[PDB]
Structure formats: C-alpha cells, structure tokens
Amino acid sequence: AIKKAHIEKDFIAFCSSTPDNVSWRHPTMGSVFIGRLIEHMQEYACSCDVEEIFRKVRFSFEQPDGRAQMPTTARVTLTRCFYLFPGH
C-alpha cells in the first residue's frame, strides 16, 4: 500500500540578514550572526524551541549600530515545536 506525503515539510531556514542587505563578519572574532546564534543556542536550547531561539537572535540585533543586520527566518513548514532537549 502507498500513501501520500507532503513534498516539502518540517523545514526552517535562518538567514544572517534581510533580502538585499549585507551580513557582517569580524576578521578575527568571526561572523556576527554566527557568534550570536551560538550564544543563544547555548543559553536557550534547554528551555526554548528552535523557532523561539531564532526570534531571540533577531531581537538581539534590534538596535542598529554602524554595522547593522536583521536575521530572517524563511520558508517555514515546521508543523510542531522543535526542542533540542540538550543532555537527552
């Protein structure tokens, strides 16, 4: 027996900036978005689902300085909450 399934489902993409816009990278400290994502994942993976962690990363970029960027969540087909449950 064969059954139908959605061709595209359970995806989430997280980009370093909005369309048309630059993303910044420190020559010694690394990419701003990457460093910020790691920091938030380390802190919030235990209690927050992936979508919420990405939202928190976005909020941390809210106040623009000389080198501004706004990370974007794109093409989301997550039907459930993705919890990492670190340690498990």
Binding site: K9, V22, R25, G35, L78
Partner: protein, 170 residues
C-alpha cells in the same frame, strides 16, 4: 560543565523536559541508538572575491555547537555551486538519517541576492547555489529518510549590497 559532551550548551533537566511535555513537539529518538547528522559548508578561499578572514572561528563555533547538541558534523570547505550540490546530494543519501530524528545544514560564504557564492564566483561568470536548490535536495522526494523530521538550514551570507538601514528623527 564544559568538560562533558554538551560543552558550553546549558543542559535540559528531566524536570524541564516533562514541563515541556504535548502532541505538538517533534519526537526525539533514543540517545543510545540515534545517529544524528549535520553538514557545514564553508567557503573561505575564493578565486575572484576577497578572502573571508575569521571563517575558521565560525567553523569551530558551529562544529562544536552541533556536536554538543548531539550531531555528527561533516565539514566541507571551498566548494563550487556544483560541488555543493554534489555534497548535498551525498548528504541526503546518508543511511544514518534513517536512524536520526533531525538534521542541521550550515552554509557560510559570500552571498548575493540570487544566493550563496561558490569558490569560482565572479560578476563575469556567476557561481551561485540558490536556497531553492537546498530545499529541493533535502525534501521528501529527494531525501525520504528525513521525512517528518526537522531540517534546520543556517546561512551566513550577504543577500545584497545595501546596508539594510533607513534614517529617522527622534
């Protein structure tokens, strides 16, 4: 502690796990049997566009983080769009995905509006991997092993030349 497998990632306690647990959460496979996979593609050295200094810091950070979250991490460096495609195709065919509950894809390179730049990219001859292609290669048709499983795609790249800001008076 940082000496453990989870490193700097704050651990979820058993009391916290039951506090979260509902029928609206992705199921997680047994830790003893699961074979979680993750892939990092990072382009640092290019033919025409300037070198991405500090990319190794990003590789280290992301590699360690995904390992801390329980993923076996494959790291591939300095690839063209065609080579990225071939690597993505190979990743989608990995048998470990069948005994995995999820995956992470990380892309780190120079970028334009159309997508992510390969190592051979120039304004004369474009070498671009589009986000659409990544999704297609990892979907239910081309990667049935990750059906019903969360696929997280992370992209560090410019999406154009604009600073992304506008002025306003307070």
């Amino acid at each position: 502690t940082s000496s453990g497998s989870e490193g700097n990632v704050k651990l979820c306690s058993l009391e916290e796990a039951q506090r979260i647990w509902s029928a609206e959460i992705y199921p997680i496979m047994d830790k003893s049997s699961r074979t979680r996979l993750a892939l990092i593609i990072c382009n640092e050295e290019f033919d025409s566009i300037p070198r991405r200094t500090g990319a190794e810091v990003d590789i280290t950070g992301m590699t360690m983080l995904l390992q801390n979250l329980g993923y076996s991490v494959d790291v591939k460096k300095n690839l063209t769009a065609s080579d990225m495609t071939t690597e993505l195709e190979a990743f989608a065919h990995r048998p470990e995905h069948k005994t995995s509950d999820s995956t992470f894809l990380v892309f780190m390179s120079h970028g334009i509006r159309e997508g992510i730049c390969g190592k051979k990219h120039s304004e004369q001859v474009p070498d671009i991997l589009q986000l659409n292609a990544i999704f297609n290669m990892l979907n239910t048709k081309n990667c049935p092993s990750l059906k019903d499983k969360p696929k997280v795609i992370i992209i560090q790249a410019c999406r154009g030349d604009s600073p992304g800001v506008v002025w306003f008076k307070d």
